[PDB]
Subunit: 295 residues, 4 copies
C-alpha cells in the first residue's frame, strides 16, 4: 500500500480580535473560525511512525493566535494568505497550506440613532468565508464566498414549460413563493504570492459587497423563470463588475412552500389566487448549482 494523499492540521479554531482607536475611543471586533491543513513531505508519520516530520496541530493553533496578534485579520483573504505563506516558508518539508476562515457578524449597534463605540449585535447567521490554498512554487488561490443569506419573495416567481412525462405530477405555475439560502463563491485569478495579494487588498471587501448587492437586487427584481435562470443573471453581473474573478459559483436550495387545500372545510378557498396560508416544507428540497466563467 502507498500514501496517495495526506493532509493534517487544526480545525475549529475560534479567534476574536479587537482593534482600539485610542483617539476616538471607537472599538471594532472581528470573530472567525479558522481551519489550517498542511501537506508536504509527511508520509513517514503515517507509514513508519516518524513524528519528526509533524508540526503538531497544537503548534498550528498557537501560530494562528500569534499571526492574528502580529497582523491584520481583515480582509480575510489577506489574513488567510499571510497564515498559509508562513507555513510553507517556515518549514522546508511543508509544501502546501490550506486555510479556511469563516467570518461571523458583529455589527455595530445603533443606539438612539447613533453608532455605539464598543457594542455589537449578531444581525444574522450569514457568513463571509475564504478558502486560501498556498502551494510552494504555484502561488495563492483564493476562493471568497458568502453563505447563509436566507431570502424569500412572495410573488414574481414562475415555473412553467418543464418536461412532462409519466414521472411528472408537478403543476405549472405563473405565481409562486421562492425562498433560498444563498451560497455564492467567487474565485480569484491565481496570485503569484503575498506581494500580489497585498496589491489587491481594496478589491476583496469591495467585491464581497458587490456580490451581496447583486445577489439581493437580482433576486428581488427578477421576474424569475426558474432558480436556474435567476442565478445565471447574478453570476453574469458579478463577472462583469470584477475582472480579477475567474469563476462564480452559486448553490441554491429551493425551499418549498406548499399550498394547503382547505376546501373540504366549509368550501374555504385557499388555492391559486385565493392562497393565503401555506405550509413550509422542511424537506425534501430542490438543489440547483451553476459555475459560470468567461467565454
Amino acid at each position: 500500500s502507498a500514501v496517495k494523499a495526506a493532509r493534517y492540521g487544526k480545525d475549529n479554531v475560534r479567534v476574536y480580535k479587537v482593534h482600539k482607536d485610542e483617539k476616538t475611543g471607537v472599538q471594532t471586533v472581528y470573530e472567525m473560525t479558522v481551519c489550517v491543513l498542511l501537506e508536504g513531505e509527511i508520509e513517514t508519520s503515517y507509514t513508519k511512525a516518524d513524528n519528526s516530520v509533524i508540526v503538531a496541530t497544537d503548534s498550528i493553533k498557537n501560530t494562528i493566535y500569534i499571526t492574528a496578534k502580529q497582523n491584520p485579520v481583515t480582509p480575510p483573504e489577506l489574513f488567510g494568505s499571510i497564515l498559509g505563506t508562513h507555513f510553507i516558508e517556515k518549514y522546508n518539508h511543508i509544501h502546501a497550506a490550506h486555510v479556511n476562515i469563516v467570518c461571523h457578524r458583529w455589527t455595530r449597534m445603533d443606539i438612539d440613532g447613533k453608532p455605539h463605540p464598543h457594542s455589537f449585535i449578531r444581525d444574522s447567521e450569514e457568513k463571509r468565508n475564504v478558502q486560501v490554498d498556498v502551494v510552494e512554487g504555484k502561488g495563492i488561490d483564493i476562493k471568497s464566498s458568502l453563505s447563509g443569506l436566507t431570502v424569500l419573495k412572495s410573488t414574481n416567481s414562475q415555473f412553467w414549460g418543464f418536461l412532462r412525462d409519466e414521472y411528472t405530477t408537478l403543476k405549472e405555475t405563473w405565481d409562486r413563493i421562492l425562498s433560498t439560502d444563498v451560497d455564492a463563491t467567487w474565485q480569484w485569478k491565481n496570485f503569484s504570492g503575498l506581494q500580489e495579494v497585498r496589491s489587491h487588498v481594496p478589491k476583496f471587501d469591495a467585491t464581497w459587497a458587490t456580490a451581496r448587492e447583486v445577489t439581493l437586487k437580482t433576486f428581488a427584481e427578477d421576474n424569475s423563470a426558474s432558480v436556474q435562470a435567476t442565478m445565471y443573471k447574478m453570476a453574469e453581473q458579478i463577472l462583469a463588475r470584477q475582472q480579477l474573478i475567474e469563476t462564480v459559483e452559486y448553490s441554491l436550495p429551493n425551499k418549498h412552500y406548499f399550498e394547503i387545500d382547505l376546501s373540504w372545510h366549509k368550501g374555504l378557498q385557499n388555492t391559486g389566487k385565493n392562497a393565503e396560508v401555506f405550509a413550509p416544507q422542511s424537506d425534501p428540497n430542490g438543489l440547483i448549482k451553476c459555475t459560470v466563467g468567461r467565454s
Copy 2:
C-alpha cells in the same frame, strides 16, 4: 396507578401567511411555528383505550391552518388567544389549551434605498415568542418573549468583589468582554377572555419593541458590575414602562472570551491592557436568571 396529569397535541406546525394590499401592491409575510397542547377529560384514552375523547392531533393541525386563514396572525398574543379559545369553546370535555408560537423574522428588503413590495430577508435568528394558556373558567395567561438576541461589548464590563475562598481561581477584573444571548419574558396580567385581549391589542407590539429597545440600550450603556446587576436594570425599566406586565424574567448566558498569554513566544504581550487576541469559549458558560416583579 392513576393519571395525575396529561396533555397532548401537535408540535412543530410550520405556518406561513401572506397579506396582499390590492391598492398599493405591497405584500407582507408572517411565518411561525406553532404548538398546541390540550387538557381536559381525556384520562380514559390512557387507561381504557377510549379514543372517543381524543380530538386527533391531525385535526389540531387542520384547525391551526383554518384559524390562520380566517383570522389575523398578528400580533401573536391575539392569534394564540383565538386559537386556544377555539378549543375550550368547541369541545365540552377540553378545559385547557396551551399554545406556543415562535415567530420567525422576515424583514422587508431595502433595494437601492427603498423598501421592496414583496422581497424579504431573514435578518437574524432572533425570535419573538408567545405562550398562551387558555383555561376554562380562569381566563387567558399570556407570556410574551424575545430570544436569540446575541450581543457583545468589548469593554465597559467589570467583575470584582466576589467571594474568594479555597475553591476560587478567578481573578478580579475592571475591564472584560461581555457577550450573551438574551432570553427575556414578560408576563401579562390575567385576561378575562378574548374580548379583554382584543381591547389591549396595540400594547403587544409596542411592549415587545420597548423590551427589545431597553435590553439593547441598557446593555450598551451600562458600565456593568455583573450580569446580575445589568439585567436587573433592564427588568426594572420594562416594568416601569408597561403597567399591565406583572413579572419580567431574564435568562442570560455569560459566553466567555479568554485572554491568551503569548509571552512564552518572543515575550509577546497579549494580556491585561495589552490583550487584543482572545479565545472564545464554547463551553462551559455562566447562566444567570432573575424574575423581577412589583414591590
Copy 3:
C-alpha cells in the same frame, strides 16, 4: 420593583473521569455534562451591585472537578446529591442547589467476542439524566430520566375510534407504523439528606434498567390502541416494580410515516395492505404526555 426569584451558576460543564483497576488492568470511563444553579440570599448582587454574596460561576466549575476527583461519579443520583449538598453546607447564605447531569454513553467494545479493557464506543445518543434539587431544611428531590431512545415498529399499532367532526380528515387505521423518541422520568420520594440517599444507592441503577426494559418490552409487545394507551402501560409497570418512586412521566413524540399513493403511475399499488414505500415526516409531530402516580 423587587426580586421575586433568582438563580445562577454554571452550565455545560463537561467532565470525564476514568477508574483504573490496578489488579485486572480494566479501565472504566464516565463522561457527563453538568449544570449547577444556586439560590439563596443573593438579591443584593442584582439590586445593589453587591458581588460579595456571589460564589463565582468559575468557582462553581472548579468545585465540580474537585468533587468528581474526590467522590464517585456513579450513580449520578449520588454524585448530584453530594455536589448539591456541598454548596448548601459550605455557604451559609446559599439555601438551594439545583444539579442537572446528562450522562453520555461509553460502552465497552467487544473485540473478537471478548470485552476490551480500555476501548469504548458511543453506541447511541440515548442519555441517562438526573435533576437533583437540594434545599436547605427540606431534603433532596431526585428526578431520574432516560431520553433519546428512538424506536420504531412497523406493525401492531392502530388508531381508530377518535372524535370526528368538521375539522377531521384523518382516516381510521388498524395497521400503521409507530415511531417515537422516549423521554421517561421517574421521581423519587423526598430523601432526608445524603445519608438516606446513600442507603438507597443500589436501587438507582436497578430502577434505570427496569424503566428502560419496561419501555422496550411494552413498546414491542403491545398491540397499541394509541400512544396514550401504550405509554400508560409502561408507567403502570414501573410504579409497580419500585415502591420508592412517586410519579412516572412520559413525553412521546409521534413521528409520522405517511403512505405514498403511486397509483397515478402505471396503477402502482402502494397503499393499505400494499404499502411498502413510505415518506418519513420531519414535522409536524404528535406530542403526547402523561404523569402517572399512585391511587
Copy 4:
C-alpha cells in the same frame, strides 16, 4: 459569460421501505436519505430560460419512490446504481447522475433474549453511505463509506517525537486519551454498468462489515504512535482484504481531553499518572486525513 458546470436535482429525500416475510411474519425496515443531482445538456435553462430541458426536481423525488417500490433498496450501492442508471437511460440529454444515499440504523430489538419480528431501535447515529456517479459512456463509480462512529480509548495512545520549535508548547506524552469520530471511505474499481454491479452484490455488505471490524480492532489494539500511524494500519488492512477497492480514505478528528491541574487546591494530584478527572474540549480539534492506495 458561459456555463462551465451545472448540476441540479433533489436533496433530503427521506425514504422508508418495509419488507414482509409472509411465511415467518418477520418484517425488516430500511430508512435512507437520498440526494440525486443530474448533469447534461441543460445550459439553456440557465442562459435562455428554456425549461423544456428540465426534468423537474419534483419528478426526480417521484422517481426515487417509484424506484424503491420496484427494486431492492439494499445494498445501497446496488440501489444507487439502479437509480442513477435510470436517469441517463431515460433522458437522452441527461448524461450524468450523482446519487448520494445515507442509510440510518434500524436495528432489530432483542426482547427477553430473542429477536423481535417487527420492532427496531436506533442504536447509534453511525451511518452507512454511498456516492454513486453514473456517467453516460464511462460506467459507474461507487464510493462506499461509514461515518459517525465515535470511539474512545483511555490509554495505549502516545504522542512524542514531534517537531519542536518556538511555536511549540505541547508536551510529549507516553499515555493519553484518544477519541475520534471515524469517517472512512472505500472507493471501488470503475464498473462497466449495472450488470457488472449486480455481479458483485455480495461483496458490498461484506466489505462494509470488514471495514468496520478493521477500524474497531485496529483502534482498540494498536499501541498508537499517532492518529496518522494508526489510521494507516486500518487502511492497509482493508486494501489487503478486498481486491476490488482502489483507494481507502480516512478522515479523523482528534477530540482532545485535557488534564486538569488541581494542585492549587489542597495539593490535590490529578496530573500525569495521577490524572483521573479530565476536561473534554469541544473545540478546537486535530483533523488528520489520509488516502491510501496500491503500490
